[PDB]
């Protein structure tokens, strides 16, 4: 089995969610955060031929980047990971599947209550700006017959009304109303255009960023109110 | 005690066995080691837990007592 | 309450070295039999609950202290 460079980039972006990601036979990868506030998955062209759990996935990728793309990765005689290149052989310790916090089954995300589209430039600007203004909470909501995404600050404003960022996202003719919010610990999606889906019921909600390579799912905090 | 409660120093020697010995002998004493009896002893006790000297739950079964006389 | 404090004072007295009738064997027998009794009832409750519920090797007892359980 060989991993493409795009597969490595996707694995590194997934490594951000959790330093240790388990792998299973197939071509579908999937992970969650340690606290369960963020989940991600992807459908990759390469097919994995063996189950294995890795602890330092960032280190594993850093080592893998040092060899040619034709490297053959497989289980070893002791159950570890072995990478055979033209003239080199890399040994890596296969971690215990128990000591990796990974989602048990792929999540069947339900029907979206709200749907819109976030452009690549919008997210690309928002993520970098959030660091500049020390913005750690950003709330999507419905305003003047449209759907817009505005960023606030939380360290000094517990009322969540001090307005620091604003971004017009799109149109929405939906009678359902909502004020969802996300912390910046959950915004780890790579630059790109994503279909944004919103679901909310009872006292909890979720947001989904589906993309042409990978899908992400982010939790909505307590103040994320929805009137459906 | 009476001299103590009045804050007056009382001389002499307090312990009295030493005074009895000094008056009883006075001169230096000559002795023979044979006559004085020295008993050298040891015991053995068997128990599951470590035997406790203070409570001594277990039985006594082996005693050795060596007499020099 | 008067009678209860008297009775409860008895056990405390029986462990005081200055008590007239103090005997370490007696106090340690009282307390060790208390331990054995509470754990014995614990085991019997465990077995009876396992039988009545139909499952096995399940610990139905939350926690017990001295007489209380």
């Amino acid at each position: 089995m060989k991993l493409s460079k795009d597969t490595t980039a996707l694995l590194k972006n997934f490594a951000t969610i959790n330093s240790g990601i388990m792998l299973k036979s197939g071509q579908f990868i999937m992970t969650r955060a340690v606290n369960g506030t963020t989940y991600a998955e992807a459908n990759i062209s390469d097919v994995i031929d063996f189950d294995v759990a890795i602890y330092d996935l960032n280190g594993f990728l850093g080592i893998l980047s040092l060899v040619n793309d034709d490297a053959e990765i497989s289980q070893s005689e002791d159950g570890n990971i072995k990478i055979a290149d033209a003239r080199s052989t890399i040994f890596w310790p296969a971690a215990d599947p128990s000591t990796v916090v990974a989602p048990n089954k792929p999540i069947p995300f339900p029907v979206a209550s709200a749907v819109t589209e976030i452009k690549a430039e919008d997210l690309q600007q928002l993520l970098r700006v959030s660091r500049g203004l020390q913005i750690d909470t950003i709330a999507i909501t419905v305003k003047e017959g449209k759907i817009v995404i505005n960023g606030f600050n939380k360290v000094e404003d517990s009322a969540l009304t001090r307005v620091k960022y604003s971004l017009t996202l799109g149109d929405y003719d939906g009678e359902n109303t909502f004020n969802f919010i996300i912390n910046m610990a959950n915004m780890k999606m790579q630059p790109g255009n994503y279909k944004l889906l919103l679901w909310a019921k009872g006292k909890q909600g979720a947001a989904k960023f589906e993309g042409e390579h990978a899908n992400y799912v982010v939790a909505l905090e307590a103040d994320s109110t929805h009137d459906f | 005690k009476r001299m103590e409660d009045i804050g007056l120093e009382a001389l002499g020697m307090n312990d009295f066995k030493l005074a009895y010995i000094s008056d009883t002998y006075g001169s230096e004493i000559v002795y023979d080691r044979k006559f004085v009896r020295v008993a050298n002893c040891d015991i053995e006790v068997t128990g599951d837990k470590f035997p406790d000297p203070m409570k001594a739950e277990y039985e006594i079964d082996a005693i050795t007592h060596y007499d020099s006389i | 309450l008067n009678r209860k404090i008297l009775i409860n004072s008895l056990y405390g007295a029986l462990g005081n070295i200055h008590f007239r009738y103090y005997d370490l064997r007696n106090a340690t027998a009282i307390t060790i039999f208390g331990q054995v009794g509470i754990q014995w009832i614990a085991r019997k409750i465990n077995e009876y609950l396992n039988k009545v519920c139909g499952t096995n090797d399940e610990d139905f007892i939350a926690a017990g202290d001295t007489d209380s359980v």
């Binding site: - | 004493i29 002795y31 080691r33 004085v36 020295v38 050298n40 002893c41 040891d42 015991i43 053995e44 068997t46 128990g47 599951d48 079964d61 082996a62 050795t64 060596y66 | -």
Partner: protein
């Protein structure tokens, strides 16, 4: 004695000074009675003889007699 031996066990001091080695034994002490009673009593008697020998060579009872007299 002014001698700082690594361990003040009777076997250790007897070995250090009398240069007489204790007979090796097997198992724990508590079962030793029921395994080899002959060996048990002989060990206890040896122990007493070893303390007698350390006394004989060092000469301490004579020292305490000379002290007290």
């Amino acid at each position: 004695a002014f001698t700082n031996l690594p361990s003040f066990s009777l076997e250790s001091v007897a070995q250090h000074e009398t240069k007489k080695g204790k007979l090796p034994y097997d198992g724990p002490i508590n079962k030793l009675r029921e395994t080899n009673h002959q060996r048990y009593i002989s060990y206890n008697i040896i122990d007493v003889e070893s303390v007698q020998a350390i006394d004989k060579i060092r000469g301490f009872i004579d020292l305490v007699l000379s002290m007290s007299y």
